[PDB]
């Protein structure tokens, strides 16, 4: 739902700013007189929270939108072709891995 997704977005906003392993902006939200239902790791929503945290990190890396922005993407179809071919090469190696694993298991 949109409300639950917004709550997960706030969880990602807190995990982007949590600067210590035991100190953060969500330690208070856990036992601070409100409900905290995304704070579970044994909840399956913990996995979507981890994905949202990975997204907040992909926005929090300095090359990801803090103070530097590279234009090899905004005006780069050649680096884009390089990246397409890189994905394709990873895919070829992975198809080989799957075939070898299936054969070994059989």
């Amino acid at each position: 739902s949109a409300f639950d997704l917004d709550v997960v977005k706030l969880t990602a906003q807190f995990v982007a700013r949590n600067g210590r392993q035991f100190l953060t902006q969500l330690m208070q939200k856990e036992q601070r007189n409100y409900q905290f239902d995304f704070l579970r790791p044994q909840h399956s929503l913990f996995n979507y929270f981890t994905k949202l945290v990975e997204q907040y990190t992909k926005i929090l890396i300095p090359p990801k939108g803090l103070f530097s922005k590279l234009k090899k993407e905004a005006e780069n179809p050649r680096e884009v072709l390089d990246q397409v071919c890189y994905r394709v090469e990873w895919a070829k190696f992975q198809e080989r891995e799957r075939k070898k694993e299936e054969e070994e298991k059989e």
């Binding site: 739902s1 949109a2 409300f3 939200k29 992909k58 234009k71 780069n76 884009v80 994905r87």
Partner: protein
Amino acid sequence: METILEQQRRYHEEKERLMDVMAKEMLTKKSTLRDQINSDHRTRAMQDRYMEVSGNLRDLYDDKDGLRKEELNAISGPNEFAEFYNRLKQIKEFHRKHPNEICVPMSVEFEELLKARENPSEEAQNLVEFTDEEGYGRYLDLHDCYLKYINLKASEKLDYITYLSIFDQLFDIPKERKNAEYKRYLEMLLEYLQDYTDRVKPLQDQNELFGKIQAEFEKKWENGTFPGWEERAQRLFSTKGKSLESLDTSLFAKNPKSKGTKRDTERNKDIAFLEAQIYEYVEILGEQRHLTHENVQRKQARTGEEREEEEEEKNLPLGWDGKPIPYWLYKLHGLNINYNCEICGNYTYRGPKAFQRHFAEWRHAHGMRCLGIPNTAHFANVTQIEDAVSLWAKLKLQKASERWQPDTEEEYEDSSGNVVNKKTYEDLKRQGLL
């Protein structure tokens, strides 16, 4: 909202979906050549979607440089968290889900069922980029520039050999005066050809190739690109010779090189750009023009059936043992006679008892169901559908007639010495009088 955060969120989603779509589109392919040209254009355009994302994200410091100091505090927390969460604790009891929170970019940069195009991909194709014979990258448009040259020169022998020789080479002594509008006409044919080339090389950086061609036009012609041994240096776009390189340069900016000739350095600017673009396009498509010329040789000397079609590129019934049925027997069975059964999808039957049994066969059964009338016998051998519906119409009328309906027949007197039917009796009975 989230600008230095949510902006990067949108940009990450956009670039990641673009990278997945680009990987799939540049790893797997199709068979079609028009589809191949359009798909190179589509890979360039997916780079361009990531390109809009990047044009938003790479100068997006107006939020980052300023919110990184206000969100760079280590004191606050559940206060602002509680402002946000108490706003978020509104009535969100609307029990339904939404995958249109992460589930856009696959439908945006993925392949379709009939044409492999995403959300953008409603008109993604080589639609107007492929002419009749051109073949999306198989042939090109030399006929139009040829017709323009014909209407210009008007020569009783300006035929295939002369056309191909003028359109294959780069910078020979041309077969027409370039000191007339023939140069501008070559520039127009080269504009068409260069558009064709910008469509036929779509995955290459268009702006970067433009900048390379601009450095070419600005240095590589006029700064001694053609050396010599009058022969030290001369121009094919100026038509002035040089006693040496320094003489060429000095006549470039002298008086008669400034404004004292209608073929001056700027007064030949349009025809010079035409000459340069034409020479570059020809010297690139030396193989492409060669394949087009081979095709034209085929389209001139090939036989009529092959050429036209490429431009456009005993009934004997079965026995148990699967052979012809002999002729007196075929006549007996009378297969020749065909029966137009309109109910059966304009199916048409040979063999009369075959025809008849078909009325209970499936295709007729289906026909009936979808006609809206059961496959009861009463219509069998009525094959036209308007006849069927009027028949079943009167049949319906008769069935409703001979039905005894207690509602209109079964009739009740009220207490007041006057009579109504069952229906109205119970109606006014249970709506509070009777």
